[PDB]
Design an enzyme around this catalytic site. Sequence first.
Site, PDB file in Angstrom:
ATOM      1  N   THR A  12       0.829  -1.197   0.000  1.00 19.07           N
ATOM      2  CA  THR A  12       0.000   0.000   0.000  1.00 19.07           C
ATOM      3  C   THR A  12       0.869   1.255   0.000  1.00 19.07           C
ATOM      4  OG1 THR A  12      -0.181   0.143   2.445  1.00 19.07           O
ATOM      5  CG2 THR A  12      -1.798  -1.249   1.301  1.00 19.07           C
ATOM      6  N   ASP A  13       0.267   2.385  -0.340  1.00 20.22           N
ATOM      7  CA  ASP A  13       0.928   3.690  -0.148  1.00 20.22           C
ATOM      8  C   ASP A  13       0.121   4.624   0.737  1.00 20.22           C
ATOM      9  OD1 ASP A  13      -1.148   4.783  -1.743  1.00 20.22           O
ATOM     10  OD2 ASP A  13       0.155   4.858  -3.512  1.00 20.22           O
ATOM     11  N   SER A  14       0.611   5.855   0.906  1.00 23.92           N
ATOM     12  CA  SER A  14       0.006   6.792   1.851  1.00 23.92           C
ATOM     13  C   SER A  14      -1.426   7.162   1.471  1.00 23.92           C
ATOM     14  CB  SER A  14       0.860   8.061   1.919  1.00 23.92           C
ATOM     15  OG  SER A  14       0.893   8.663   0.638  1.00 23.92           O
TER      16      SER A  14
END
EC number: 3.1.2.-
Lengths: 134, 133, 133, 133
Positions: A12-14
Amino acid sequence: THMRCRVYYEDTDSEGVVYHANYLKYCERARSEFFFKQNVLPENEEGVFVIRSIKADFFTPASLGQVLEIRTQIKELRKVFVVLFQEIYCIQNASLEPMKPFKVFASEIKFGFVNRSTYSPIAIPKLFKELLNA
Amino acid sequence: HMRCRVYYEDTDSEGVVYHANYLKYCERARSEFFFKQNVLPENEEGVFVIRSIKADFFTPASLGQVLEIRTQIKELRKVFVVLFQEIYCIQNASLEPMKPFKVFASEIKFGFVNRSTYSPIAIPKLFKELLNA
Amino acid sequence: HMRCRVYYEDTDSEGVVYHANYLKYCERARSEFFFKQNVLPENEEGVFVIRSIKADFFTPASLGQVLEIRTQIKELRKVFVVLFQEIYCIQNASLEPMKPFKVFASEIKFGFVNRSTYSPIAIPKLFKELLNA
Amino acid sequence: HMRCRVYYEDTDSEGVVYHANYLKYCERARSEFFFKQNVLPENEEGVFVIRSIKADFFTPASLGQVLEIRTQIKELRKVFVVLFQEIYCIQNASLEPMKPFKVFASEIKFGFVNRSTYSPIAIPKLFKELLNA
């Protein structure tokens, strides 16, 4: 049938969705597992597959805890190259509540086969050709 | 436009850059464009979203090489931007002179959307101005 | 126990798993414990936060191998939990018989934090009861 | 000291750097020391292998921040080296004022080994003097 991948924190990312390049990793796993499942690596004593090009479209982003299904098909298989079509669908959420599978990503990827040193185009090995056909 | 070094984390068992990592170098060049101008490439309610990628792979780079990522704006409209990026290898770690060579190229289309709804909106003035300059 | 396959993305130029990837494997094993029971390892008010890691590297894993991550609760308190995790290689892609061998071990301490502040609070009842098993 | 930017690839869903990435940053800092002396951290029949890590995590870093990796030799033997590496966050992308803060600290032990055998061998003289410097 197919390969299934869980979306973990590492993926995942931010923004809370899968980081875009990770979909390529999922596709790669799918391709390699076809060979692993026939007890071989996707490379041999004097050759290796090399990615030539990718065309990728992004649809509904995937997120933490989902299970993604990678669907793979041979678009075109020639003596010197293969083109694969791969689509990724989300098939489960982390809560395991009922859901219609939804498309997340599609790609069309072309591979050549080459000698390791020279990197020169050679024919796909006959054994790998057969495996791809299947 | 931006330079980066190939580290162990970037390579695979074949001794070259794992293919997906070229997309990461390209992402860094996009984001650093904003960061160096002291903004994040996102704001209050909105973010850029990748619509599509077309990428071509050429001569592979390897451990300790210095790569140069060059970014140009192929198309900029009210609601989307298309970037063309090419990566060249320019230096070995050993420093032996070499003619730079193309390693990767990509054309990527971005929209700008509201975070919650994914509804398309115009690229914010802030980012549009920056992209114009 | 959870099992994972070594893919090209996991390897480095030396033909072995890139060292930091073993931590990713251990993370997967922790998260799957929650995922199994149809929940995320986080909730409305809090998240687990890693405090410390002691890790050891033994015989390296390589492409196509299957690894098994073994996880135990070393210590469970109101405010933290310490997990001990070991990774063993248990299969070759080729299925040639092999004695399993240890690849990696880690002992990690996790606190649970009230999100915004990042202030340490008790592990919630649901996770507590799960984590106990 | 090496400086690294936090990119999206480095972040997780909680908006902070995914924990394993701090090891990648420390690795870059190590290899860059070698790359700067025009060498790779390996030679014709020897490579460095990580044996153990002890690490502590402090205040998390986030998107766009600049991290500084500070490296010192804790111990150097003919057979192995222990490095102490600390990461500090030093700036925001926005340059909104901030007091630099500690993000991560690790002590990492490395042996030098034969590839064929993984049997330990003396750190190479060129590398031994690099490390001491």
